[PDB]
Amino acid sequence: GDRVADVIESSIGDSVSRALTHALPAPTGQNTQVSSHRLDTGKVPALQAA
Amino acid sequence: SDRVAQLTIGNSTITTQEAANIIVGYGEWPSYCSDSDATAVDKPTRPDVSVNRFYTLDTKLWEKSSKGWYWKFPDVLTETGVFGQNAQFHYLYRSGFCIHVQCNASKFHQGALLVAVLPEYVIGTVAGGTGTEDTHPPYKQTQPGADGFELQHPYVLDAGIPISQLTVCPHQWINLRTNNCATIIVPYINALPFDSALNHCNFGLLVVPISPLDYDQGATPVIPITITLAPMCSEFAGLRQAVTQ
Known part of the structure; x- marks a missing residue:
């Protein structure tokens, strides 16, 4: 009998693969959408950290 | 009704009294490019007045022993106006012509x-x-x-x-008994939606006399031939420094 608590809450016996991602379809390349000019702060896609 | 005609595009204007009907080359009008056909992503520019107007090239002469001429479009306008000074900056070009x-x-x-x-x-x-x-x-x-x-x-x-x-x-035709001018409208004829304006030359105008000029003395011998033309539905893309050739 599993009467202790550290055995009930245990993560042992996990046959599942936690996947962050998930596949999607792509029969064609992506359709470029329209854009216009923006002059805002905070928003800044160019600056990355590699 | 079919003889008199007028042509107003841009700041400019043309009249004529002894003309004929207008032709549309290959049965359709000019147009701007579709979002499906197009491939480039950059937003073009479309001035709509500074480029789409009548430019006048040069005035030839028609003697009795004349043979013919040709002009290549749109090479004729690569040094003339805000048209030409856009076509040097940009790389891609699209237009029609009257x-x-x-x-x-x-x-x-x-x-x-x-x-x-x-x-x-x-x-x-x-x-x-x-x-x-x-x-x-x-x-x-x-x-x-x-x-x-x-x-x-x-x-x-x-x-x-x-x-x-x-x-x-x-x-x-220009049969001097009947008419005195010829108006032709042309769409953009190419396999590619955009193409350069300096290297490629999409079509050529020809003017060839079949029946030769003739007259009698005492009459004015100088019979010039003038060529007028107008861009239409002009687009440009790929901005950078100016390239003469």
Whole structure:
């Protein structure tokens, strides 16, 4: 009998693969959408950290 | 109704009294490019007045021993106006054209021209005359400018093809008894939605007299031929520094 608590809450016996991602379809390349000019702060896609 | 006509695009305007109907090359009008056909992602520019107006090139002369001429479009306008000063900056180009031709004369003169529009009119040399000597046409015969270039062998149009079959293209005549001008409208003819304006030359205008000019003494001998034309639905893309050639 599993009467202790550290055995009930245990993560042992996990046959599942936690996947962050998930596949999607792509029969064609992506359709470029329209854009216009923006002059805002905070928003800044160019600056990355590699 | 069919004789009188007027042509107003841009700041400019044309009148004419003894004309004929207007032609639309290959049965359709100009247009801007679709979002499906197009491939480039950059947003074009579309001035709509500074470029889409009548430019006047140069005024030739028509003697009795004249043979013909041609002009390559849109090479004619690469040094003329805000049109040309955009076509040097950018790399990609799209446009249509309206083309109006002038030649006046009295009711004692006689003659006939043929005003045709041929896409991809490659020029071919004479192979030295013997046939063996391979040659190529120089730069001033393929992009001669706005001053035009004169034909040497017009029966074959300098490309091994007769002039007898040039009417299958968009053509008009100027029979001096009947009319005094020819108006031709043309869409953008190319396999690619955009293409350069400096290297590529999409079509060539031809003006060949079939029945020669003739008159009697005491009459005005100078019979000029003037060429007028207007871009339409002009787009540009790929901005960068100016490139003459």
